Every structure is written in structure tokens, then in C-alpha cells.
Amino acid sequence: AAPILFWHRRDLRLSDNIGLAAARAQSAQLIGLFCLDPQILQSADMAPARVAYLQGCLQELQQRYQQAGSRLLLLQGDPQHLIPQLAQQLQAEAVYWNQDIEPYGRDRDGQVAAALKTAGIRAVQLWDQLLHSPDQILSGSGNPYSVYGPFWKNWQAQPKPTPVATPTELVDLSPEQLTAIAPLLLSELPTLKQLGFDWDGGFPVEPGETAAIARLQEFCDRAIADYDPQRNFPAEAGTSGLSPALKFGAIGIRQAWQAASAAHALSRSDEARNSIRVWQQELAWREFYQHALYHFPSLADGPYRSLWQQFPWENREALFTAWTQAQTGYPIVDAAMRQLTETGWMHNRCRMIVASFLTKDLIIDWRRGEQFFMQHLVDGDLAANNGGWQWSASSGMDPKPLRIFNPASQAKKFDATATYIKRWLPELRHVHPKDLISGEITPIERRGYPAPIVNHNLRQKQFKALYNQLKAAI
Numbered sequence: 001a002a003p004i005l006f007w008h009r010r011d012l013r014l015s016d017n018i019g020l021a022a023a024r025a026q027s028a029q030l031i032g033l034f035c036l037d038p039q040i041l042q043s044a045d046m047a048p049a050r051v052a053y054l055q056g057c058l059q060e061l062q063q064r065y066q067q068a069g070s071r072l073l074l075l076q077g078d079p080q081h082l083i084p085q086l087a088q089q090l091q092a093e094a095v096y097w098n099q100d101i102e103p104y105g106r107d108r109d110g111q112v113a114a115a116l117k118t119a120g121i122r123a124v125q126l127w128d129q130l131l132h133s134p135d136q137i138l139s140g141s142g143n144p145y146s147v148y149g150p151f152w153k154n155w156q157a158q159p160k161p162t163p164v165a166t167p168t169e170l171v172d173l174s175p176e177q178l179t180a181i182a183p184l185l186l187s188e189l190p191t192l193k194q195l196g197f198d199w200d201g202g203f204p205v206e207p208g209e210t211a212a213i214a215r216l217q218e219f220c221d222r223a224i225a226d227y228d229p230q231r232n233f234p235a236e237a238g239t240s241g242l243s244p245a246l247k248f249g250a251i252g253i254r255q256a257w258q259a260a261s262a263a264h265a266l267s268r269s270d271e272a273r274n275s276i277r278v279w280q281q282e283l284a285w286r287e288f289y290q291h292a293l294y295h296f297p298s299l300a301d302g303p304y305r306s307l308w309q310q311f312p313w314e315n316r317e318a319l320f321t322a323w324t325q326a327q328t329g330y331p332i333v334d335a336a337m338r339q340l341t342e343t344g345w346m347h348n349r350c351r352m353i354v355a356s357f358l359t360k361d362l363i364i365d366w367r368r369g370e371q372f373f374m375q376h377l378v379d380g381d382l383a384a385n386n387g388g389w390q391w392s393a394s395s396g397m398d399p400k401p402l403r404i405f406n407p408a409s410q411a412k413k414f415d416a417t418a419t420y421i422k423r424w425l426p427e428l429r430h431v432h433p434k435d436l437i438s439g440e441i442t443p444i445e446r447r448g449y450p451a452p453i454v455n456h457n458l459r460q461k462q463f464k465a466l467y468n469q470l471k472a473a474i
């Protein structure tokens with residue numbers, strides 16, 4: 001008959017899904033689909049933790065479609081070839097999907113749409129992962145924002161969209177239709193091992209739409225009230241842990257905003273009100289970087305600002321390796337890198353500390369770090385990750401005066417009792433918090449823990465010297 005295909009990519013859920021809801025209003029014969037794209041899966045920048053989470057979200061999505069009335073088709077190969085072929089073999093009335101903000105996804109999408117148009121099949125691309133699309137937030141001159149302040153002021157004033165309906169009572173494909181597409185389908189969802197990956201480090205929130213919705217609700221029911229200032233301490237479990245759920249769409253952005261907004265209205269405490277407004281602004285910050293990547297795709301290439309594209313990075317491989325292996329000798333840094341490689345997630349305050357360290361202290365092209373994070377983060381996200389690293393050098397959007405973190409100051413300020421440090425560096429649980437914070441540990445009391453790979457003071461003078469020299473040379 002006239003079935004509609006909904007192509008899932010980073011919206012692995014059936015609830016509050018813009019493109020999916022629009023598709024259901026056009027037809028009950030709604031068949032979901034996911035394509036295992038080799039250019040994504042085989043990339044050297046793919047994190048095992050991310051594939052594990054992804055695979056887990058898909059397992060649940062297969063069930064949701066089954067329960068809804070149809071199914072989730074699985075494909076493996078090139079999208080602009082396989083999607084059009086599948087839609088054609090199925091004489092699809094249309095193929096729906098939610099828009100991407102990333103260069104690769106957008107280029108791929110334009111190609112799939114063109115292939116569909118050629119085949120005479122409708123392609124509908126709608127915005128779903130953002131409360132406000134990049135085209136809705138523009139300045140008085142109709143231009144994008146590269147400074148957060150003005151962006152937030154506009155974004156905040158825009159009326160917020162509400163969650164859309166979950167599609168129900170779907171019509172499954174028939175045997176004859178299934179025969180027509182048989183050659184293009186995988187018989188079953190490959191396991192993590194079959195795909196060639198292994199992960200046993202756990203997750204910030206268990207995989208799947210259900211677990212994501214439960215976490216959102218548990219967070220907004222309590223912990224969110226203390227977000228500010230509990231968000232600043234790595235030792236405290238004061239954040240939501242929903243990052244991978246938002247990256248893969250296990251949770252809808254409108255459900256998240258609504259749950260927080262409802263918690264704000266329910267709250268009668270001023271401090272709780274503030275804490276919730278602060279969390280909400282985190283979501284605004286997320287959109288700033290996503291819109292930035294959309295408007296200025298070259299950001300993905302590396303240092304944006306002209307001065308930084310010329311910065312003389314030292315790039316001592318040995319220093320980088322030590323960083324990736326948590327053998328820097330700086331407790332607060334090694335504890336964080338251990339949390340990342342071991343659990344696939346890192347507290348935001350720690351991401352800032354280790355990024356600054358790699359760029360300011362080790363003086364390594366931050367792209368090596370951006371890539372290492374992408375190779376390990378369960379929430380590895382180009383817009384946010386690139387935004388985070390451009391930040392470590394003010395080389396991109398919303399630049400700030402040159403500054404260099406002192407691991408010791410940060411450690412003392414956000415892990416004053418060294419609880420987080422001892423937690424991830426148990427072999428140093430005997431050392432005094434004072435020494436773990438300052439980074440000055442006596443050889444005997446240090447055991448196998450390495451000594452500082454660099455002298456902060458000297459590295460700091462070196463970085464500024466290179467900055468001022470290039471600053472003048474221009």
C-alpha cells in the first residue's frame with residue numbers, strides 16, 4: 001500500500017518525536033528504520049561506550065515498535081543507496097527523519113533526499129533535537145550569534161514547544177512487502193561483540209527510552225533543587241547524567257524542558273527555583289553550541305579564530321600519551337582521565353580542568369584531546385565536545401581573555417577534601433588531601449604514582465610567551 005518510513009538516527013525513542021509524530025498524522029502504516037552506517041561505525045573516533053549505549057537504545061526501540069503495531073527495520077551499509085532502494089522496493093509514500101546539525105549528517109541527508117526525489121518519493125526533514133531550530137534564533141540583522149549573552153536573551157524569550165504524541169495503533173508490513181525488501185535487511189540487531197566492540201564500564205544512565213524518562217523524572221523530583229551549587233563538585237552526584245540520553249535521543253528535548261518547568265512551578269523555595277533555572281540554562285547552552293556548529297561548520301575543523309589557527313603547538317607526543325593514560329602526576333587530572341576511560345563519562349568541571357591542562361600546560365593541539373574525548377565519551381557530541389575544546393583556548397565561539405587554569409586551585413576549589421581524587425585514584429587513598437590537591441606528593445608516599453610530567457609554573461610561562469610572541473608577530 002502506502003507506507004511511510006521513519007528514519008531514526010539520534011532520536012532513538014517513540015515518545016515526543018517531532019518527525020515521527022508528523023509521520024503518524026499522515027499514515028498508520030508507519031515503519032521505523034535504522035541504518036548501521038559504516039562511515040560512522042568504523043570511524044577511529046567511535047567510542048565503545050557509545051556503541052554499547054546505542055545498541056541498548058535500539059534493542060528497546062525494536063520492542064516499542066513491536067508494541068506499537070509495526071516494526072523497526074535494520075539496515076547495514078551506505079544510507080544514500082540503501083534508504084532510497086528500501087523506500088522504492090516498498091513504494092513508500094514518504095521517508096521522514098529529524099534534521100542533523102553536523103556536517104556529515106547534513107551532507108548525507110541532502111544526498112538521501114535528492115535520491116528520494118529522483119525516485120519520486122517524498123522526503124520530510126523536521127527539527128526535533130532542539131527546542132529552537134538554528135533558523136529561529138537570529139539577531140536583529142538576521143544573523144547567527146557567536147556570543148552567548150545575546151543568544152541567551154533571545155532564546156529565553158522564545159515561547160517553548162511542548163511534547164508531541166507517541167504514535168499508536170500502527171500497521172505492520174505484510175509478507176509480500178517483507179519479501180520485496182528481504183535483501184536489504186539484517187535478520188537481527190547485531191550484538192556489541194558481533195560488531196567488534198566490548199564495553200563493561202557501565203553508563204551514567206542505563207540505555208533506552210524507559211531508563212531515560214525515569215532518570216529525568218527522578219532528577220526533577222529532587223536532585224534538581226540542589227543543582228546550584230551541587231553541580232560544581234565532581235565528588236557530588238549533582239548532575240542529571242542524561243547527556244548520552246540527549247545525544248542519542250533516548251529522551252526528547254521538550255520532555256526535559258517540561259519536566260524542569262513543572263518542577264519550577266511546583267517548587268515554593270527560592271533556592272530550588274534558582275537551581276532549576278540554572279539547569280534549564282544548561283539546555284540553552286547546549287543549543288548555543290549546536291546552533292554554532294550549524295551556522296559555522298568550519299568550527300569542526302579546529303581552532304576558529306585566526307590567531308589560534310597559527311598558534312605554535314609544541315605537540316610532544318609523550319606528554320599527550322601520559323595525559324590519555326592518566327599518568328600526568330597531577331591528581332585532579334589523572335582521577336578525571338581515569339573516570340573517562342573507565343566509565344565513559346566525566347564530570348563537566350573535570351572536563352574543563354583536563355582540557356585546560358592539555359592545552360595550557362602540555363601545550364598540545366587541542367584537537368588531539370577533542371578526538372580522545374570522542375573516542376571515549378558515551379555522550380561524545382561534536383557540537384558540545386568541539387565547543388568544550390574551543391573553549392579551552394578561546395579559539396572559537398564566545399571568546400574570553402587569555403587565562404590558564406592551575407590544577408591546584410581548581411582541585412582545592414571544587415574537590416577541597418579530595419574525595420573525587422581518592423575515589424578514582426584509590427592507590428593514593430593514604431595520601432593527605434592537602435598533598436593530592438597541591439600535587440606535591442613525597443616519593444615514598446607516592447608509590448607507583450608518577451611524578452608531575454611538567455612543571456606547571458614553567459609550562460604557564462611558556463604558553464603565555466608563545467601567545468604574546470604570536471600576538472605581536474601579527
Ligand SMILES: Cc1cc2nc3c(=O)[nH]c(=O)nc-3n(C[C@H](O)[C@H](O)[C@H](O)COP(=O)(O)OP(=O)(O)OC[C@H]3O[C@@H](n4cnc5c(N)ncnc54)[C@H](O)[C@@H]3O)c2cc1C
Pocket residue numbers: 231239240241242243244246247282283285286289346347348349351352355373377379380381382384385386387388389391
Ligand atoms: C572539554 C569538554 C568536552 C565536552 N564534551 C561533551 C560531549 O562530547 N558531549 C556532551 O553532551 N557534552 C559535552 N560537554 C559538556 C558537558 O561537560 C556535559 O554535557 C556534562 O558533563 C553532562 O553531564 P550531565 O548530563 O549530568 O549534565 P547536566 O549538568 O545534568 O546538564 C544537562 C544537559 O545539558 C547539556 N550540557 C550541560 N553542560 C553543557 C555544556 N557545557 N555544553 C553543551 N551541552 C551542555 C547536556 O546535554 C546535559 O546532559 C563538554 C564540555 C567540555 C568542557
